[PDB]
Amino acid sequence: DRISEIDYEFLPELSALLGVDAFQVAKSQEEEEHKERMKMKKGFNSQMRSEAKRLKTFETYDTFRSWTPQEMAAAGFYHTGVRLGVQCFCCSLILFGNSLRKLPIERHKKLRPECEFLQGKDVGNIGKYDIRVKRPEKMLRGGKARYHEEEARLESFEDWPFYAHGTSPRVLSAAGFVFTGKRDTVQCFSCGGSLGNWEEGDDPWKEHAKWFPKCEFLQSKKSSEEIAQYIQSYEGFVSEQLRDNYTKATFRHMNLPEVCSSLGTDHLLSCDVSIISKHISQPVQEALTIPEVFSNLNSVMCVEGETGSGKTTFLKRIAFLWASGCCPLLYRFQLVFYLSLSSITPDQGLANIICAQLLGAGGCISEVCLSSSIQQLQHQVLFLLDDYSGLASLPQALHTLITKNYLSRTCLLIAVHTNRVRDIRLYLGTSLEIQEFPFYNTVSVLRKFFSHDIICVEKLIIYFIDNKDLQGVYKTPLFVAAVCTDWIQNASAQDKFQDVTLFQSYMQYLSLKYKATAEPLQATVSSCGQLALTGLFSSCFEFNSDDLAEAGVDEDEKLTTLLMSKFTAQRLRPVYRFLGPLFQEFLAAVRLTELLSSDRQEDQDLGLYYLRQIDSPLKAINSFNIFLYYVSSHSSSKAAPTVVSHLLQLVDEKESLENMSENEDYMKLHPQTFLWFQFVRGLWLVSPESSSSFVSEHLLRLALIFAYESNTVAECSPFILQFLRGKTLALRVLNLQYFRDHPESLLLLRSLKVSINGNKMSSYVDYSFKTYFENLQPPAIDEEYTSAFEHISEWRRNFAQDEEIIKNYENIRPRALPDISEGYWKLSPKPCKIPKLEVQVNNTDAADQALLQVLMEVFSASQSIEFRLFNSSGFLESICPALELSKASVTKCSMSRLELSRAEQELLLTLPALQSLEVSETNQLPEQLFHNLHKFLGLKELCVRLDGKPNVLSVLPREFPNLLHMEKLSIQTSTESDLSKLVKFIQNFPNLHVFHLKCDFLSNCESLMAVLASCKKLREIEFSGRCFEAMTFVNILPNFVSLKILNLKDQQFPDKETSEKFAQALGSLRNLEELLVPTGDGIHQVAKLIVRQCLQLPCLRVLTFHDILDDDSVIEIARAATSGGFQKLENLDISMNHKITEEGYRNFFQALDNLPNLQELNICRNIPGRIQVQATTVKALGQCVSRLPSLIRLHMLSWLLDEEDMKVINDVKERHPQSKRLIIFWKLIVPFSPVILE
Amino acid sequence: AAARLSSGLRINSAKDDAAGQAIANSGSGSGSRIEDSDYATEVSNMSRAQILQQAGTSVLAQANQVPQNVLSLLR
Ligand SMILES: Nc1ncnc2c1ncn2[C@@H]1O[C@H](COP(=O)(O)OP(=O)(O)OP(=O)(O)O)[C@@H](O)[C@H]1O
């Protein structure tokens, strides 16, 4: 009887615990809201099947789940594919969220206290049609009033079908059966034969002779030949007895229980091994369920697996069942012979072979009493064997049993270690094999042997974090059995990273059991792990017979050997196999750390060879990262630092990533690398510093760990210090130092960020200033040319839709900012001294009492104080109490958004005497700053720059009083120069030491003498004039030799003399590394010289042009390129339009080679767009140029196939970054108007 | 002498450094800002195209957060 509505519930009560390990439970209910949304959409339906089917429903049931299929079993819950759902058939209820503390029966018994074990009498399992029939139909003597006819007995079926109401009483009457009324029983009066347990679709005319071959009523009608047709069906082919009770009693007595050396607290452990039946003659793997497998037993059978995988255990259930009243398969035999003995096999043998189990009490037992009696009945014969080959010579098993069935045709299950199959398979029927161990039976096991102490709770959370690194860990329950020691610390463990702890135990397990002579063991472990050496080498797991010679184990194959490696059944005979990828990965470390045992010297050169195949920093943090922990795990004191030397050696200096990915397909064994690597790479791609900064952490993380094996003192200390030098890191490292102790660590810098908010401003929209460009019209050609394109919205959503995924993870975190002990285990010592603390901030969203009152003490013990800010314009005065200690920030202050006004009254009131200040945007006030600016200031270079805003001269008509140590300055002419601005700037510079000038747009106007006449010894020169002078520029500008850089643009004006005056003096004064060429006047003619003698430059990078191409400029480059002298240059560009012509790029690409000194080259800004053949010439670009990170070409608009030409011939040199072939196109129509033509 | 690192923690730093690199993004308008845009377009274009990969992978990094949080409710 179904029901309706009644949204169910999952327990909020205890769930407040899990909120610790996870983020927040309050958001859990929201997930469970789907359930009623789901459930209602499901059919509430009604009765379907008796449980014994339901196991099949769980064939595809996800293995990783908490609850056990056989838990759902006695619940009879159907498995529906939608989500995970399971289904009360007697009740209506349907469940999703599983509970570890709670068996299913509860949830069913609690919530719907109605029909199940309250005995509304729905279903039956272990079904037989013997305890339906053999014993039962006896009493059915006189079980009815007289029926010679099927109609009057059909009448009895009136009562029968509440269970069914499905299969017709007719057909059974058509078979002449009577419903006695007890349960669903129906009986054939003639033969007296009965049955029950009716699957929808069961014909008696199917069933009858199978269960009643000699029934006269049947045989009087259905004739004969029919039967062997019908006889084809699912189930198997079908003191004499006092000797059996002994057999029964034997297993009935305690032998098998308490098999785990721990204790037998649960002596019958019901968690069951997943069996697969693979077909001999064709590939079908045919997954099965155990109770099914029972009735599948016909004659000989396989029972395949590896070792400690459940071989003996599975058979052992049979007996301890077979004795007891239980599931059908047992109930047919009166005999079962369990002998696992290989020991007997040499013997000529005896019945006394069985006397192993008899424990005497025999002696009438005889071939007389056995052999012909064993063939007296055929079927009740059964054997259970741990054995193989058939090599042992026994008339009993060998000379009779496996050889000739059709004399006997009796059933056997044979425990076989996998390596023993391929000798005797041809005699052997279709497979009985073991897939692996379901992850739940573990969790089933881990329930029993524990008090469920939130040790298992702490487990899965790992096995959520790790996936492949987890879900494949368990293969043999023996691994659980290794854990099953379960005292290891106090228990399995209370400790994190349960991977090692498993493995770490599992080894030293096999020691114990097999430590009588462990010398072979370690030797085997040692000699095989040389295979695991190749784990670092590559992933090739085939391990043919040959490379085993390098391991040297081969067929020597002590029983020990099995515990690691196995074989595999062949399509082609030569073959091999190994246990599992993760277990292997851990074998390596152990074998590895056998090497680097300093008392071994000659050989440890091996490891010295291996560990130097780790050469990238990104092999360290991802590829073998999880591996290196296995190394630190096994913890051999002597090795570890010697290893650490290599790792800390790895970064070198100023080489970011020698190879970003040397990655193999080994990665597949762990997915996260793909994510991390890119994330790493991508991170590197925006900020060369922070990459190395980030990477530095995990090394130091890895580093410190090995030190914390045992001794950080001797060998560890020196290596680290080197690595620490000049670095920049994040405060997470502090608490991350156990190493916090030794010294207040120096020779480095530190970073910190606070950003909680999404962006707010118009700074992007300046595309609006690109609107006048007719952006509507241009797009024309390339059926693909769409694919070249994006629109702001299209991109806008792309970005924002992704932040939404963050937004989830934002809320459920009740979490804000660092310093658990991170400042405190930092500040646990009193005299901490921090040289530099770098602070990037965005929005006030982190303004808060304690969170900052945390950061309050951060500033203490940190000697210099730095800032960069975007979103918040008001965060200053939010700080003041934190800095009311007047901690002398100094350093520099970077700003984008507003200065908050009366804020810097603070920066006034601070009076640390800052070195520098950076404000590039918005507006500024003297009552913000420039009031009395100088007084305690005057130290290092400033930046104050605004868009159109005036009053940059009124900045400092106070400065002339000041006598400055600045010597370095940045500011523009915010007009066409006003003598004020000069008058402002003039007096200053003669009175200061003139280093490193920056001017955005100098309106050259008049008297840049008064600007540049004093100019001396600069590196920074940023001026770009809209109006020129070209006196200084031609004369004194190139009178000061030593210069690295030039920033110049904005319309070189046309005196080709002046150009010469430049060009000559440009060529004459060359010290430079780099520059910005002024934007052309038509310079093009002589700009040859702006190339020709540029070979003279002692150092090269940042080659810069907005102009000057179409002429010979290309080979002018290429000559200077092909011939030396532009070697070590780092950059190339052009922004042109006019001087853009396809015709010469090929000529430019004619010979571009022999400069693998370069990074990027950009060809861009086509309003028109540029699409032509020279994409052909691109096929040679990256290949022969060797080293490049990347390119930017916005003209390309390339054929996707020609972009396949791009993407394919891209990666031949490298795995890493690429040319950017599409912009974010201001949102526009993209017309096909030419396409109108075809 | 007890190993300490956390993966459930690892992701946090990864989250951090992303937002740090929306910051390194820099751009400068102009009174002209057109000729600048010429240059600046690419500059932004690169930066954007750069960023999208960052913030995209940022999710790809945190893409694994959400399920483990949710699935524990199911456990
Ligand atoms: N469902 C289970 N519940 C509890 N323990 C199990 C279960 N299945 C297997 N085991 C453990 O795993 C081990 C399986 O090894 P088993 O004895 O079956 O193999 P074998 O015939 O001895 O050959 P080998 O030991 O080489 O596998 C058993 O010792 C048992 O303790």
Q: What is the DSSP string of A690-750?
A: HHHHHHHHHHHHHHHHHHTSS--TTTHHHHHHHHTTTEEEETHHHHT-STTSS----SEEE
Q: Rounded distance, CA A919 to CA A876, Å?
A: 14
Query: Same CATH topology for A14-111 and A136-230?
Result: yes
Nearest chain A Cα to B69, which residue?
A22
Q: What is the maximum span of chain B, computed from C-alpha positions, in angstroms?
A: 63
Question: Which residues are registered as beta bridge partners of A1131?
Answer: A1160
Q: Smallest CA–CA separation between B9 and chain A, in Å?
A: 10
Q: Where in A949-1005 does DSSP place strands (E)?
A: 969-970, 997-998
Distances (CA, A) of A943 to A447, A759, A895, A909, A952: 66, 24, 10, 21, 12
Whether B23 is in a domain gets the answer no
CB spacing of A809 vs B66 below 8 angstroms: yes
Ligand 1 within 6 A of CB of A304:
no
Return the axis-axis angle of helices A625-634 and A500-514, rounded to nearest 10°.
Answer: 40
Please report how many Cα atoms fall inside a 13 Å half-sphere around the Cα of residue A899, on the Cβ side. 26
Q: Rounded distance, CA A23 to CA A105, Å?
A: 30
Question: Chain B contact for A1164, CB < 8 A?
Answer: yes
**Residue A752 CA to ligand 1 centre (angstroms):** 54
Mutate-to-test residue for ligand 1 from A269, A272, A311, A313, highest number of ligand atoms within 8 A of CB: A313
Ligand 1 within 6 A of CB of A641:
no
- Which atom of ligand 1 is least distant from the CA of A312? 18
CB pairs under 8 A between A and B: 196
Q: Which of B23, B50, B63 sits opposite A685 (nearest CB)?
A: B50
**Residue A312 CA to ligand 1 centre (angstroms):** 6
Q: Rounded distance, CA B22 to CA A229, Å?
A: 76
Technique that determined the structure: cryo-EM
Q: Which of A495, A679, A948 sits opposite B61 (nearest CB)?
A: A679
Q: Is A119 left (phi over 0), alpha (psi -120 to 50) or beta?
A: left
Strands A834-841 and A862-865: parallel
CB spacing of A769 vs B34 below 8 angstroms: yes
Q: Which of residues 55-74 of B touch A (CB under 8 A)?
A: 55-74
Question: Chain B contact for A1226, CB < 8 A?
Answer: no
* Domain that includes residue B73, residue range: 31-75
CB spacing of B63 vs A805 below 8 angstroms: yes
Q: Is A1027 left (phi over 0), alpha (psi -120 to 50) or beta?
A: beta
Other C-beta atoms within 10 Å of A360: how many?
8
Is the CB of residue A1124 less than 8 Å from the CB of residue A1096? no
Helices within A140-268 (DSSP H only): 150-154, 169-174, 204-211, 216-219, 225-230, 242-252
Q: How many whole angstroms from its chain centre is CA A138?
A: 64
Q: Span A136-230: which CATH code?
A: 1.10.1170.10
Ligand 1 within 6 A of CB of A310:
yes
Instruction: Provide, as residue numbers in chain B, all residues whose Cβ is less than 8 Å from the Cβ of A701.
Output: 5
Q: Which of A497, A1106, A1162 sits opposite B3 (nearest CB)?
A: A497
Residue with tokens 């919205």: A793
Question: Chain B contact for A489, CB < 8 A?
Answer: no
Question: Chain A contact for B18, CB < 8 A?
Answer: yes
CB spacing of A466 vs B7 below 8 angstroms: yes
* Check whether domain A14-111 has CATH 1.10.1170.10, yes or no: yes
**Residue A314 CA to ligand 1 centre (angstroms):** 8
**Residue A822 CA to ligand 1 centre (angstroms):** 47
Other C-beta atoms within 10 Å of A463: how many?
20
> What element of type H or E holds A565?
strand A565-566
Is the CB of residue A1111 less than 8 Å from the CB of residue B44? no
Other C-beta atoms within 10 Å of A1183: how many?
13
Instruction: Provide, as residue numbers in chain B, all residues whose Cβ is less than 8 Å from the Cβ of A822.
Output: none
Q: Is A580 left (phi over 0), alpha (psi -120 to 50) or beta?
A: beta
Return the axis-axis angle of helices A639-649 and A716-723, rounded to nearest 10°.
Answer: 10
Is the CB of residue A192 less than 8 Å from the CB of residue A140? yes
CB spacing of A464 vs B68 below 8 angstroms: yes
Phi, psi torsion values for A400, nearest 5 degrees: -125, -60
CB spacing of B23 vs A1223 below 8 angstroms: no
Q: Rounded distance, CA A851 to CA A849, Å?
A: 6
Q: Smallest CA–CA separation between A692 and chain B, in Å?
A: 12
Q: Rounded distance, CA A679 to CA A709, Å?
A: 30
> What element of type H or E holds A942?
strand A942-944
**Residue A309 CA to ligand 1 centre (angstroms):** 5
Ligand 1 within 6 A of CB of A413:
no
- The domain limits of chain A are 14-111, 136-230, 242-435, 461-750, 751-757+832-961, 758-807
Distances (CA, A) of A491 to A454, A455, A520: 12, 9, 30
Q: Is A892 exposed, middle or buried (0-12, 13-18, 19+ CB in 10 A)?
A: buried
**What are the residues whose beta carbons fall under 8 Å from the beta carbon of A883, sequence distance 6 or more?**
A859, A889, A906, A910
Q: Which of B20, B59, B73 sits opposite A31 (nearest CB)?
A: B73
Q: Rounded distance, CA A1079 to CA A1020, Å?
A: 19
- Name the token pair of A120: 């509304």
- Which atom of ligand 1 is least distant from the CA of A562? 26
Strands A862-865 and A748-754: unpaired
Q: Is A747 left (phi over 0), alpha (psi -120 to 50) or beta?
A: left
Whether B52 is in a domain gets the answer yes
Handedness of CA A737, A741, A744, A746 (dihedral sign): negative
- Which atom of ligand 1 is least distant from the CA of A272? 1
Instruction: Provide, as residue numbers in chain A, all residues whose Cβ is less than 8 Å from the Cβ of B43.
Output: none
Q: Rounded distance, CA A684 to CA A698, Å?
A: 15
Q: Which of A701, A710, A1192 sits opposite B1 (nearest CB)?
A: A710
Whether B37 is in a domain gets the answer yes
Phi, psi torsion values for A557, nearest 5 degrees: 45, 60
The tally of domains found in chain B comes to 1
Q: Where in A374-428 does DSSP place strands (E)?
A: 382-386, 411-417
**Residue A315 CA to ligand 1 centre (angstroms):** 10
Q: Which of B23, B49, B70 sits opposite A31 (nearest CB)?
A: B70
- Name the token pair of A1187: 């080293």
Nearest chain B Cα to A838, which residue?
B20
Is the CB of residue A726 less than 8 Å from the CB of residue A747? yes
Resolution (A): 4.3
Helices within A540-638 (DSSP H only): 548-551, 559-562, 581-594, 605-610, 617-618, 625-634
Strands A337-339 and A304-305: unpaired
The radius of gyration computed from the CA coordinates of chain A, to the nearest angstrom, equals 42
Q: Rounded distance, CA A941 to CA A997, Å?
A: 9
Q: What is the maximum span of chain A, computed from C-alpha positions, in angstroms?
A: 133
**Residue A293 CA to ligand 1 centre (angstroms):** 19
CB spacing of B37 vs A766 below 8 angstroms: yes
- Among A826, A796, A805, A609, smallest CA distance to A731 is for A826
Q: Rounded distance, CA A943 to CA A963, Å?
A: 19
Q: How many whole angstroms from its chain centre is CA A963?
A: 60
- Which atom of ligand 1 is least distant from the CA of A441? 1
Q: Rounded distance, CA A293 to CA A94, Å?
A: 28
**What are the residues whose beta carbons fall under 8 Å from the beta carbon of A502, sequence distance 6 or more?**
A473, A479, A482, A483
Q: Smallest CA–CA separation between A355 and chain B, in Å?
A: 49
- Among A678, A811, A787, A758, smallest CA distance to B56 is for A678
Phi, psi torsion values for A273, nearest 5 degrees: -85, 135
- Among A353, A355, A358, A359, smallest CA distance to A341 is for A353
- Name the token pair of A1078: 């002024």
Q: Smallest CA–CA separation between A307 and chain B, in Å?
A: 30
Sheet holding A86-87, edge to edge: A78-79, A86-87, A94-95
> What element of type H or E holds A822?
none
Question: Chain A contact for B43, CB < 8 A?
Answer: no
What would the DSSP string read from start to end of A1141-1156? -GGGHHHHSTT--S-T
**Residue A263 CA to ligand 1 centre (angstroms):** 15
- Which atom of ligand 1 is least distant from the CA of A306? 27
Whether B35 is in a domain gets the answer yes
Question: Chain B contact for A453, CB < 8 A?
Answer: no
A242-435, CATH topology level? Rossmann fold (3.40.50)
CB spacing of A738 vs B60 below 8 angstroms: no
Question: Chain B contact for A117, CB < 8 A?
Answer: no
Instruction: Provide, as residue numbers in chain B, all residues whose Cβ is less than 8 Å from the Cβ of A635.
Output: 1
CA torsion A1220-A1223-A1229-A1230 (nearest 10°) is -20
Mutate-to-test residue for ligand 1 from A290, A303, A312, highest number of ligand atoms within 8 A of CB: A312
> What element of type H or E holds A338?
strand A337-339
Residue with tokens 């699409």: A1171
- Report the residue of A11, A25, A809, A1138 to disrupt the B interface, i.e. the one with the largest count of B CBs within 10 Å: A809
